[PDB]
């Protein structure tokens, strides 16, 4: 299977390249290897964009 990630805090994006999200939102990772911001897909909005890795945690 896979490891999903969960938002720990709300976040308001400043660019459309980034997702805005709310605490408890779940994401699939598209790319987590290029840097501290991860390209992700929100299972709530269906949108794809970057998320800040310090705002999420893996499902555990």
């Amino acid at each position: 299977g896979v490891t999903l990630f969960v938002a720990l805090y709300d976040y308001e994006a400043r660019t459309e390249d980034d997702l805005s999200f709310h605490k408890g939102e779940k994401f699939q990772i598209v790319n987590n290897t290029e840097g501290d911001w991860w390209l992700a897909h929100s299972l709530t909005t269906g949108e794809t964009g970057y998320i800040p890795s310090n705002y999420v945690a893996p499902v555990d």
């Binding site: 290029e34 840097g35 911001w37 800040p52």
Partner: peptide, 12 residues
């Protein structure tokens, strides 16, 4: 710096 490598936001 690419989008992936921007500074992270501070924790709330």
């Amino acid at each position: 710096v690419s989008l992936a490598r921007r500074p992270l936001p501070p924790l709330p």
